[PDB]
Design a protein around this nucleic acid. Structure first.
Ligand SMILES: [Mg+2]
Ligand SMILES: [Zn+2]
Lengths: 242, 50, 182, 49, 99, 49, 124, 91, 55, 99, 174
RNA sequence: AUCUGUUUGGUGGAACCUGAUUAGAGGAAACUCAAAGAGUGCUAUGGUAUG
């Protein structure tokens, strides 16, 4: 926790991520560009043996991420892995897309998509320091508009706040997502529908996914971290949903 | 009469934290960590039966 | 033989190269494995004997119930088999039909008896020691592992007196006495 | 094998009509298009892709 | 409860050891006696088992471990306090190294 | 035939001579193959032969 | 109607006459007749106070084998009844479901592999 | 490998038994067997055993609780029986 | 292989798979290879065809 | 702890023999030789045995608390089973007015 | 130098890799619903959503209550009734006698929501939707379905009895 | 200390009980030989052959 404590890193169930055991346990991803924390979080450092080097790990804050909240609540399957291609819709900045890039590692790639231009500038600077990311500063409801930059991505993550979430996911996933490909949605009930209740919103959006040919595998609510939020993991089928 | 109902309500709120996982605001201090431990082998997510 | 596909399986539902239906569950080879016997003919000689006992039991059953002849002969049969050792209870004539089995005869065989009396540690060990000639029944040594030892000779299986097995057994207990040249 | 493979039903169009389909006309030029009219009175132009 | 006063649920206390027998300390009640008899019967049960095994030993049993185990000439077993099979005693080369 | 199909009133082919469209009194428009054992796949020359 | 020696003889008359090749007493009955009569009595009591499926399960026979046996037997029953009714002879009354019982079934013991009737149609 | 086993094994044992180091801090019940591969690093903003035994309040708590447990077991066992025999043999 | 009384069927490694209780006393073996039929002709004056895929 | 007589222990069969180690008298060379560390490794070992003892005591007390709760739950469960059984008997005996 | 206790080499039916019967040889404790008090389900509020079953349709025809009218009269709020695809297929499979009940069910205010499974078992589909979501109140008259949905904690039940409808586990009917 | 005797870690596992297995089990070697699964790679290309 503090500035000098010593912890034991350990592989989690999902590959790519790690647990730092101590008097309190910390979710951790291996830092790609070592020596600079992106959003000011503390970070662990080990030394490994030619002369040895200093490898660095980075803490994952779930009161800021909405994917480490899913990891900590416990998702059985997350389709992000140490070698894949991830399309990140709604990538505000490094505060989650950098952790996803450290998870997919130097082999895989991550295409971050944002609309507004001040988070665009943040994304451009962080992506300059980190080579797995390619940034797009364009509206995410127009895969035809950015079709020359993406080829056959392997999973999609969605942190979109707009109330057309299921249609924009369906467009991008028909265009680019591979068959039998992981879809991960973070639903915010208050953004999607404010009058009716959160459970009604959740059933409604899982219905929209099943209509747009994504078979939902599981659904977590991530309660001690955020309120009225949900994570839906599904698999893009395209052939025999039954 | 309402003191019993007040004490039953707060007793039930403690039982609710024991059963479910409730929203305690968020972090306001610096994130010190999960004070109770991370588990690997458990999956508290509702699996969609087909 | 290739884990053939679905339509191949539906067209060949009934083929099997390893297990046919005359190899009646491979019961013979399974019992030969359990009690470590040396030939197929031995299992099926025992099966012929059990078949003869069972047809005699069926005919005595078909005789009328309160028949002195029936009671006399079924009692002679149960007494004979219990004295031999094959069946364990002298009281049930539906045991005389039901529980007479090749495994019952095959475990009155000799290395099973040694292994049960704890002369040996496995039945393969008992077969090896018999073949190397350490075991005597009575005063004369037995070299055949397929010896059917009854109850009243299970009272007489011993080690042959000049064996390194007997020397080691006594020497472990610290009781060797070479006056006998044990 | 043709007995084992014979599976003719493919699907239905939409949720269907509401009273019973009595008239059907296929577009003689194009391939996906047909028009079905019920006894309710409602007629529908249908994509079959 | 049902139809019982508290004075009916009184809690009678218990008496201690008589004063002139303070040498022979702590007068024993039924709970202490039942502990005693339970433990004595456990010990007697395992002793009856071991004596029936000693009766039905069958002195022709040969297990292969008789070439590694050794039995004391008085009658008990002996056992290496070292755990292994090899560390009974060194050889001259490793004595040279260790010196 | 199928249990849910009452009283077929209108039936057509498809314009590629492969499927059959049947509208029935039930209120449903169903679509079948013309040869059941076929599939609408495309086939390598080895399988096609 | 309550004397049970006579009623047992009347029920077992068919098996006695089938394995004749008259001994009806329990002491002097012998062989397959003894086996089948004892099985019949035990079946009667168990039927009066037991569950119908566990009482009367049949024996396993493959599908085309049992269907061929059923059709052969049904043809012999149709021939026998047509012969009687043609050259007029009264026959014992069978129910509408079940089969007739003939000396063919008493010799061959076919009611262990076929049964009383066809329970799928009887259930319909 | 089997290097630095003293400090590393003591730290691993401490983390495995971390639910006894603090009275007001308890954990989810997990059975944490020692992992195959791990690394030991610091946090950028000694060892855990020596900082733990350098803390004072935790040390006093360990002393108090150890003395309590040991007085319980030693009160139960033998020495009592020697006291009883001596109390009889005295007079 | 044909043996003293019974024909035996062995694997590619000598693992005995079957013994044929019905093929008594054979001296001549053969195999019709499209029909998958083992033909055994013996000293009993009998001639037996045994389908080896079904058993 | 119990003791077996030497005659029993001397006639026990091979498999069920008791292993007994005598407290060694002389000083062996390795025990004369091997060195132990002073002060700080000493405090390390003391601290570790303190932690392990506290953990064992806490685990035993929690386990015994939960065992008592299990006994309470068993008794309540048995009373609920009694009620269920009687209500089923009255349901069936009532049902056979319709049959 | 040659070995003892030999024996002819055969098949192991208890251990072989080729034999067909012998050939084949992260817990999930689901969180309780975040929208549930101890037994209350505080996230059902007007307007309500209600799954329909075939027995409910049939008995509503036989006792003459229009679906939306009687459902509004029961709950006193507005009700969105939903037919699932397996329920509609159960009705169509019932067929020519119950076709008037099918034609009542094909109504432009009965929003049909699709289901993704094989078969047409409405009991399993409805029980799984209810177990996953906790936002629908169920409407049926089947005894087995009533018992499963009673055992599910926090899902209100609704049948048809006498003339009007009857709900069971909604804490605010009045 | 010819002091007492507890906790922690190593060694050894008897009596009863519960499972699982049983021609007792463990290990090695490898450009050895043999069956059999799971995946990956390959323009893997005559909708009717070469005008
Ligand atoms: Mg139903
Ligand atoms: Zn459904």
């Amino acid at each position: 926790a503090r500035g000098g404590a010593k912890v034991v890193i350990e592989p989690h169930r999902h590959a790519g991520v790690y647990i730092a055991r101590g008097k309190e346990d910390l979710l951790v991803t291996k830092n790609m560009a070592p020596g600079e924390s992106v959003y000011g979080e503390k970070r662990i450092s080990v030394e490994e043996p030619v002369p040895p080097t200093k490898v660095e790990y980075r803490v994952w804050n779930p009161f800021r991420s909405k994917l480490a909240a899913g990891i900590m609540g416990g998702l059985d399957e997350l389709f992000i892995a140490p070698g894949k291609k991830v399309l990140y819709l709604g990538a505000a900045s490094g505060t989650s897309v950098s952790h996803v890039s450290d998870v997919v590692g130097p082999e895989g790639v991550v295409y971050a998509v944002e609309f507004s231009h001040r988070p665009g500038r943040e994304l451009i600077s962080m992506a300059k320091k980190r080579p797995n990311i390619i940034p797009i500063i364009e509206d995410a409801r127009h895969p035809q508009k950015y079709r020359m930059l993406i080829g056959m991505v392997d999973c999609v993550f969605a942190d979109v706040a707009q109330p057309d979430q299921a249609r924009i996911i369906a467009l991008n996933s028909h265009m680019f997502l591979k068959d039998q490909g992981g879809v991960v949605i973070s639903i915010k009930a208050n953004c999607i529908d404010s009058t009716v209740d959160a459970e009604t919103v959740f059933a409604r959006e899982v219905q929209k996914l099943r209509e747009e040919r994504i078979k939902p595998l599981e659904q977590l609510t991530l309660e001690p971290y955020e309120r009225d939020h949900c994570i839906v993991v599904g698999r893009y089928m395209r052939s025999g949903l039954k | 009469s309402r003191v019993k109902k007040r004490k039953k309500y707060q007793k039930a709120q403690k039982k609710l934290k024991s059963v479910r996982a409730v929203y305690s605001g968020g972090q306001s201090g610096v994130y010190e960590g999960e004070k109770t431990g991370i588990k690997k082998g458990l999956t508290r997510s509702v699996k969609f039966k087909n | 033989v290739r884990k053939l596909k679905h339509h191949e399986q539906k067209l060949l539902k009934k083929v099997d190269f390893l297990e046919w239906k005359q190899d009646q569950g491979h019961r013979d080879t399974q019992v030969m494995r359990t009690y470590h016997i040396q030939n197929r003919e031995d299992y099926h000689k025992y099966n012929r004997i059990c078949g003869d006992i069972r047809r005699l039991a069926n005919k005595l059953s078909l005789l009328p119930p309160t028949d002195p002849f029936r009671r006399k002969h079924e009692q002679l049969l149960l007494d004979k088999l219990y004295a031999m050792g094959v069946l364990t209870t002298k009281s049930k004539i539906s045991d005389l039909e039901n529980k007479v089995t090749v495994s019952a005869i095959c475990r009155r065989r000799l290395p099973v008896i040694m292994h049960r009396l704890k002369m040996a540690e496995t039945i393969q060990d008992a077969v090896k020691f018999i073949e190397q000639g350490h075991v005597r029944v009575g005063p004369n040594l037995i070299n055949d592992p397929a010896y059917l030892v009854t109850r009243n000779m299970e009272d007489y299986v011993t080690w042959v007196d000049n064996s390194k097995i007997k020397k080691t057994l006594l020497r472990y207990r610290n009781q060797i006495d070479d006056f006998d040249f044990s | 094998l043709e007995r084992m493979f014979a599976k003719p039903f493919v699907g239905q169009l939409g949720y269907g009509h509401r009273d019973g389909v009595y008239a059907i006309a296929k577009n003689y030029g194009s391939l996906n298009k047909l028009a079905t009219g019920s006894a309710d009175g409602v007629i529908k132009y249908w994509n079959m892709s | 409860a049902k139809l019982v006063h508290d004075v009916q649920k009184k809690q009678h206390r218990e008496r201690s050891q008589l004063t002139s027998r303070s040498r022979y300390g702590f007068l024993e009640k039924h709970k202490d006696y039942v502990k005693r008899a339970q433990d004595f019967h456990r010990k007697q049960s395992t002793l009856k088992v071991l004596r029936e095994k000693a009766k039905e030993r069958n002195p022709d049993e040969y297990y292969h471990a008789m070439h590694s185990r050794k039995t004391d000439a008085k009658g008990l077993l002996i056992s290496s306090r070292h755990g292994d099979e090899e560390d009974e005693s060194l050889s001259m080369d490793q004595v040279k190294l260790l010196k | 035939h199928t249990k849910r199909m009452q009283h077929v009133f209108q039936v057509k082919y498809s314009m590629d001579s492969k499927y059959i469209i049947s509208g029935s009194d039930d209120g449903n428009v169903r679509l079948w193959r013309s040869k059941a054992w076929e599939r609408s796949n495309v086939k390598t020359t080895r399988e096609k032969n | 109607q309550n004397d049970l020696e006579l009623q047992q003889f009347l029920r077992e008359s068919h098996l006695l006459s089938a394995f004749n090749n008259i001994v009806y007493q329990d002491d002097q009955v012998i062989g397959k007749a003894r086996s089948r009569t004892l099985e019949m009595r035990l079946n009667r009591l168990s039927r009066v106070n037991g569950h119908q499926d566990k009482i009367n399960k049949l024996e396993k026979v493959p599908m085309h084998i049992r269907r061929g046996m059923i059709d052969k037997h049904v043809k012999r029953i149709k021939k026998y009844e047509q012969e009687a009714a043609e050259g007029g002879i009264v026959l014992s009354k069978v129910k509408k479901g079940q089969f007739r019982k003939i000396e063919s079934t008493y010799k061959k013991d076919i009611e262990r592999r076929i049964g009383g009737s066809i329970k799928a149609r009887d259930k319909e | 490998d089997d290097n630095m086993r003293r400090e590393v094994q003591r730290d691993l044992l401490l983390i495995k038994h971390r639910a006894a180091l603090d009275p007001k801090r308890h954990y989810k019940k997990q059975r944490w067997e020692v992992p195959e591969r791990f690394a030991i690093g610091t946090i950028i903003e000694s060892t855990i055993l020596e900082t733990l035994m350098g803390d004072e309040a935790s040390n006093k708590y360990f002393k108090r609780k150890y003395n309590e447990i040991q007085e319980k077991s030693t009160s139960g066992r033998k020495a009592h029986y020697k006291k009883m025999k001596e109390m009889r043999k005295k007079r | 292989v044909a043996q003293k009384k019974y024909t035996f069927i062995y694997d590619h490694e000598g693992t005995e798979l079957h013994r044929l209780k019905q093929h008594i006393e054979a001296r001549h073996l053969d195999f019709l290879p499209y029909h998958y039929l083992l033909v055994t002709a013996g000293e009993t004056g009998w001639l037996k065809y045994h389908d080896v895929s079904t058993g | 702890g119990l003791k077996v007589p030497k005659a029993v222990q001397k006639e026990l069969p091979f498999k069920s023999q008791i292993h007994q180690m005598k407290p060694q008298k002389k000083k062996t060379y390795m025990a004369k030789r091997a060195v132990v560390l002073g002060g700080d490794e000493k405090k390390a070992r003391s601290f570790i045995q303190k932690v392990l003892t506290i953990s064992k005591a806490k685990d035993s007390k929690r386990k015994e608390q939960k065992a008592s709760q299990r006994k309470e739950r068993l008794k309540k469960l048995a009373k609920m089973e009694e009620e269920k059984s009687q209500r089923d008997k009255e349901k069936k005996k009532e049902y056979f007015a319709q049959n | 130098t040659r070995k003892f206790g030999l024996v002819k080499r055969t098949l192991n039916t208890k251990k072989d890799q080729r034999l067909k019967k012998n050939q084949e040889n992260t817990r999930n404790i689901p969180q309780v619903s975040s929208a549930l008090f101890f037994q209350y389900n505080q996230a059902i509020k007007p307007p309500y959503q209600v799954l329909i079953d075939t027995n409910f349709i049939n008995f509503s025809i036989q006792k003459k209550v229009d679906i939306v009218r009687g459902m509004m009269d029961c709950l006193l709020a507005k009700c969105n009734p939903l037919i699932t695809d397996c329920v509609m297929a159960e009705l169509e499979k019932l067929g020519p006698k119950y076709r008037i009940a099918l034609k009542l069910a094909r109504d432009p205010r009965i929003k049909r929501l699709s289901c993704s499974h094989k078969g047409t078992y409405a009991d399993d589909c409805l029980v799984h939707r209810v177990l996953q979501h906790k936002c629908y109140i169920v409407a049926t008259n089947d005894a087995g379905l009533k018992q499963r949905i009673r055992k599910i904690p926090g899902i209100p039940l609704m049948s048809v009895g006498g003339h009007a409808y009857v709900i069971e586990k909604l804490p605010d009917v009045f």
